[PDB]
Design a protein around this ligand. Structure first.
Ligand SMILES: *[C@H](C)[C@H]1/C(=C/c2[nH]c(/C=C3N=C(/C=C4\NC(=O)C(C=C)=C4C)C(C)=C\3CCC(=O)O)c(CCC(=O)O)c2C)NC(=O)[C@@H]1C
Ligand SMILES: *[C@H](C)[C@H]1/C(=C/c2[nH]c(/C=C3N=C(/C=C4\NC(=O)C(C=C)=C4C)C(C)=C\3CCC(=O)O)c(CCC(=O)O)c2C)NC(=O)[C@@H]1C
Lengths: 318, 316
């Protein structure tokens, strides 16, 4: 069963669009790093390895903000942090989460001349999502079809992907594409049913906790995460924004002409279950910044509430 | 409206919490500045008329403001986080346009706020979006319950001592129809006020400037100087920093509302100013632009629900 989960947490591979550090929960020093992190974060005991102090990597407001995060509980972390590398000023969004023993930081590059617009762009992303949420709210109740069609249209406009689908899980765990919008000319997948095994339990289980997942390029060469072999626990990457897709799925995307994807879990009663996914595909590589993904998380949460109301209301009328 | 509009539209006095520049769209050079701008933005001659912003700000900052000249008002995404070239001091630059001028308000940012710039913007908008979902799920039918919820939500989001819903009657006089305060404050719930307490000129400006903040009614106002070559006065009333008229400043001091934040409630935005959400604080208070921006959208949603409650009511 869960030889799948072993590889999906302890696989130690990330997507190369960003890099990863894990810091010790007490010393704040590097205990693990992706192999691309030296070249991404430094110009260059190298400049970056096990035991590196982050005060040597980043400017003082940047390192200061990460040191302070080492003091904050998980739910109290406000992401992302805007960080600059020492000397170069090279900027990244740092997205922080905690595992037992460690603070994990995903670093996603930002275009330097866009740094002045970071707050502006984050507000605009959430504003657009918030407007989408008001349009979901004003929909007349009583039609799951209208709700799902509206949601895929909103996600399509917000995210700019080639294809957006609502993928519903049936009682037997097989899935169905129940709503879809594409750029003109693409073949539809609307209506198609797919076996339970296309989306393994481990992936469904992960979606309960990791609610938005982005794959930038299914063909990109994955990068290993190295950790001190004496670290008294294994570092899991299930929470990382950068976690590489399992090679099977990477192959699956290749076969389907989805080079890129963005997937939002739809969890009702967040008893709790995965109702389905909002699945975005792109024909070419696609990156969208963490603020938009964050705004999409809330949109998906509101959608799930409305989904569950439509279920209740058609459970009642019958 | 005769006299008031002249002075308010020119907006030659600002609050000292921030500073203002106006740039000529054609040249990108300074054509107006608040008298505190030299001290705030500098430590190449003095900042004055004719100054090139490439001498005031770091290169990415100056480029971001120069790029803003090529956006229609409606397409400006605010704020811009700028750093001063000499000091490295950070500010939020809030940009608006008046014809061929670009007007920039600069509000200081604390050094530890800079790395959390996007994080704090998302959190402010997330809190406001959650407030919006609670407004939406309110059962229809009660203007009172709607306004009560709104003042509660604004109170929690903004941290002011007092939040009121202030409704304009057909004769333009006002009534406080909902209120929440910290314990011990004197209530104004239910009180009616004359139309003249909020002049037409003020009500007209709220149609366009939807959120207005006063940090400290006692603070000494700062003059804006403009290019002597201009044969007319610039309009600076779009500024976030515009100083309150001294009559209003006195009224606040009288009332022991030292600070305020006021949101316009415009229905059919039939288009009219239904009222105001009025926040007061006993002591000075500043809230940063991203939160005020998020408040603007909360107020817009509120206005939609107010007009629904009006229509549900005219149906009975
Ligand atoms: C390999 C032997 C098997 C397998 C494994 C597998 N699949 C996933 C994850 C996903 N598979 C998805 C399938 C679909 N996506 C679509 O667009 C459609 C239909 C139009 C289907 C049916 C989706 C979605 C996911 C989620 C991926 C994501 O974005 O996170 C995984 C986990 C991948 C990971 O590492 O997270 C694995 C191991 N898939 C197969 O087809 C075979 C049977
Ligand atoms: C001066 C002779 C007259 C006058 C002028 C005046 N008033 C305003 C603006 C406002 N007055 C407000 C009044 C209230 N605030 C409250 O909390 C209550 C009741 C509880 C009332 C009635 C409010 C609000 C405003 C808006 C101010 C804001 O925050 O923008 C103005 C415009 C000031 C400006 O510079 O924008 C002027 C010129 N007020 C008087 O009382 C007398 C008659």
């Amino acid at each position: 069963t869960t030889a799948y989960l072993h590889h999906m947490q302890k696989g130690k591979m990330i997507q190369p669009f960003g890099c990863l550090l894990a810091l010790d929960e007490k010393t704040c020093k590097v205990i693990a790093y992706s192999e691309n992190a030296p070249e991404m974060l430094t110009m260059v005991h190298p400049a970056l390895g096990i035991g590196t102090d982050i005060k040597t990597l980043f400017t003082a407001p940047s390192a200061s903000a990460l040191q302070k995060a080492l003091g904050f509980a998980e739910v109290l972390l406000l992401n992302p942090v805007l960080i600059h590398c020492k000397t170069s000023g090279k900027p990244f969004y740092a997205i922080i989460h905690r595992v037992t023993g460690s603070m994990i930081i995903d670093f996603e590059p930002v275009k330097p001349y866009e740094v002045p617009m970071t707050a502006a762009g984050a507000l605009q992303s959430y504003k657009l999502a918030a407007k989408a949420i008001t349009r979901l709210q004003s929909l007349p109740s009583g039609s799951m079809e209208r709700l799902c069609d509206t949601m895929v249209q909103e996600v399509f406009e917000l995210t700019g992907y080639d294809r957006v689908m609502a993928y519903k899980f049936h009682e037997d765990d097989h899935g169905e594409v129940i709503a879809e919008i594409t750029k003109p000319g693409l073949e539809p997948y609307l209506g198609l049913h797919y076996p339970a095994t296309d989306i393994p339990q481990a992936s469904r289980f992960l979606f309960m906790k990791n609610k938005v997942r982005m794959i930038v390029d299914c063909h990109a060469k994955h990068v290993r995460v190295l950790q001190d072999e004496k670290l008294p626990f294994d570092l899991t990457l299930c929470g990382s924004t950068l976690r590489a897709p399992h090679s099977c799925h990477a192959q699956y995307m290749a076969n389907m002409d989805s080079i890129a994807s963005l997937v939002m879990a739809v969890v009702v009663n967040d008893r709790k279950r995965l109702w389905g996914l909002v699945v975005c595909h792109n024909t070419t590589p696609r990156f969208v910044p963490f603020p938009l993904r964050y705004a999409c998380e809330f949109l998906a949460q509101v959608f799930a509430i409305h989904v569950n109301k439509e279920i209740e209301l058609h459970h009642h009328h019958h």
